[PDB]
mmCIF file of N, CA and C in Angstrom:
data_model
loop_
_atom_site.group_PDB
_atom_site.id
_atom_site.type_symbol
_atom_site.label_atom_id
_atom_site.label_comp_id
_atom_site.label_asym_id
_atom_site.label_seq_id
_atom_site.Cartn_x
_atom_site.Cartn_y
_atom_site.Cartn_z
ATOM 1 N N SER A 267 -17.597 1.246 -20.336
ATOM 2 C CA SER A 267 -16.559 1.476 -19.323
ATOM 3 C C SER A 267 -16.087 2.923 -19.313
ATOM 4 N N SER A 268 -15.057 3.240 -20.106
ATOM 5 C CA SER A 268 -14.372 4.574 -20.146
ATOM 6 C C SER A 268 -13.729 4.996 -18.803
ATOM 7 N N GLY A 269 -13.413 4.012 -17.916
ATOM 8 C CA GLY A 269 -12.967 4.458 -16.576
ATOM 9 C C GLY A 269 -11.600 3.983 -16.326
ATOM 10 N N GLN A 270 -11.073 4.119 -15.147
ATOM 11 C CA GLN A 270 -9.791 3.452 -14.772
ATOM 12 C C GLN A 270 -9.880 1.936 -14.705
ATOM 13 N N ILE A 271 -8.761 1.284 -14.588
ATOM 14 C CA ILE A 271 -8.680 -0.176 -14.566
ATOM 15 C C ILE A 271 -7.498 -0.663 -13.625
ATOM 16 N N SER A 272 -6.571 0.243 -13.391
ATOM 17 C CA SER A 272 -5.484 0.006 -12.483
ATOM 18 C C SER A 272 -5.168 1.275 -11.700
ATOM 19 N N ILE A 273 -4.470 1.123 -10.572
ATOM 20 C CA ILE A 273 -4.058 2.259 -9.799
ATOM 21 C C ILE A 273 -2.565 2.484 -9.936
ATOM 22 N N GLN A 274 -2.206 3.782 -10.256
ATOM 23 C CA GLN A 274 -0.766 4.214 -10.300
ATOM 24 C C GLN A 274 -0.316 4.535 -8.841
ATOM 25 N N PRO A 275 0.688 3.928 -8.348
ATOM 26 C CA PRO A 275 0.992 4.234 -6.922
ATOM 27 C C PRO A 275 1.802 5.514 -6.668
ATOM 28 N N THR A 276 1.328 6.319 -5.760
ATOM 29 C CA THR A 276 2.013 7.589 -5.495
ATOM 30 C C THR A 276 2.767 7.529 -4.206
ATOM 31 N N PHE A 277 2.470 6.633 -3.365
ATOM 32 C CA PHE A 277 3.209 6.593 -2.088
ATOM 33 C C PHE A 277 3.797 5.242 -1.745
ATOM 34 N N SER A 278 4.690 5.258 -0.795
ATOM 35 C CA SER A 278 5.337 4.046 -0.380
ATOM 36 C C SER A 278 4.614 3.466 0.816
ATOM 37 N N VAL A 279 3.673 2.624 0.607
ATOM 38 C CA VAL A 279 2.994 1.972 1.758
ATOM 39 C C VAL A 279 2.538 0.548 1.447
ATOM 40 N N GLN A 280 2.250 -0.258 2.503
ATOM 41 C CA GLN A 280 1.705 -1.598 2.273
ATOM 42 C C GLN A 280 0.279 -1.566 1.735
ATOM 43 N N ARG A 281 0.260 -1.723 0.419
ATOM 44 C CA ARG A 281 -1.012 -1.635 -0.327
ATOM 45 C C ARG A 281 -1.202 -2.609 -1.473
ATOM 46 N N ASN A 282 -2.227 -3.423 -1.364
ATOM 47 C CA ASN A 282 -2.635 -4.284 -2.439
ATOM 48 C C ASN A 282 -2.846 -3.374 -3.679
ATOM 49 N N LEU A 283 -2.119 -3.545 -4.776
ATOM 50 C CA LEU A 283 -2.360 -2.677 -5.860
ATOM 51 C C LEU A 283 -3.484 -3.106 -6.799
ATOM 52 N N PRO A 284 -4.597 -2.378 -6.856
ATOM 53 C CA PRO A 284 -5.781 -2.690 -7.691
ATOM 54 C C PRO A 284 -5.625 -2.612 -9.235
ATOM 55 N N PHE A 285 -6.096 -3.682 -9.885
ATOM 56 C CA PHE A 285 -6.231 -3.751 -11.333
ATOM 57 C C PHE A 285 -7.402 -4.734 -11.624
#
C-alpha cells in the first residue's frame, strides 16, 4: 500500500467523503 486511505476535507461542499 503506502498510500492514502481517507480524504481530509478542505472545502465546504456536498461531497461523499472517501475512506
